[PDB]
Amino acid sequence: RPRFSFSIAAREGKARTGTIEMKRGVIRTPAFMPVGTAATVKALKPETVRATGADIILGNTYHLMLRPGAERIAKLGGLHSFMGWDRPILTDSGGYQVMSLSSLTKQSEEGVTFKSHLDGSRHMLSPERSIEIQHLLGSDIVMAFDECTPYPATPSRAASSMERSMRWAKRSRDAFDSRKEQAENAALFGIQQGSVFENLRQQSADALAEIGFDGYAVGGLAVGEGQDEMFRVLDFSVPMLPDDKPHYLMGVGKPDDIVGAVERGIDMFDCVLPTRSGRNGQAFTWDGPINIRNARFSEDLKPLDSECHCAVCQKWSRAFIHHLIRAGEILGAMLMTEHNIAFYQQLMQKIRDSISEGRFSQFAQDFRARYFA
Active-site pick, 140, 214, 267, 270: 270
The reply to whether 302 sits near a copy of itself by the rule CB under 8 A is no
Task: Determine the straight-line distance between the first and last CA of the chain, rounded to whole angstroms.
Answer: 44
Q: Provide the CA 112 distance to its chain's centre, in angstroms.
A: 23
For a copy of itself, the closer of residues 231 and 316 by Cβ is 316
d(CA 150, CA 157): 9
d(CA 38, CA 328): 22
On whether 108 is known to bind a ligand per the annotation, the reply is no
Note the helical H segments in the chain: 46-51, 61-66, 70-75, 79-83, 95-101, 127-137, 155-177, 180-185, 198-211, 227-237, 255-263, 278-279, 311-315, 318-327, 330-356, 360-371
On whether 235 is known to bind a ligand per the annotation, the reply is no
The correct pick among 262, 339, 345, 346 for binding Zn ion (CB under 5 A) is 339
- The residue type of 285 is T
The reply to whether 205 sits near Zn ion by the rule CB under 5 A is no
- Per-residue b or e along 93-126, where b marks 16 or more CB atoms closer than 10 Å to that residue's CB: bbbbbbbebbeeeeeeeebbbbebbeeeeebebb
Q: How many chain residues bind a copy of itself (CB under 8 A)?
A: 33
The correct pick among 1, 67, 106, 157 for binding a copy of itself (CB under 8 A) is 67
* Residue 92 is a catalytic residue: yes
The reply to whether 42 sits near a copy of itself by the rule CB under 8 A is yes
For residue 315, the partner it binds in Zn ion, a copy of itself, none, with Cβ less than 5 to 8 A by kind, is a copy of itself
Judged by CB under 8 A, which stretch of 126-134, 141-149, 225-233, 296-304 contacts a copy of itself? 296-304
For Zn ion, the closer of residues 208 and 308 by Cβ is 308
Q: Which residues of the chain form contacts with a copy of itself (CB under 8 A)?
A: 38-40, 42-45, 67-68, 72, 75-77, 82-84, 298-299, 301, 315-317, 319-320, 323-324, 326-327, 329-331, 333-334
Q: Which residues bind Zn ion (CB under 5 A)?
A: 308, 310, 312-313, 339
Query: Which residues are known catalytic residues?
Result: 92, 270
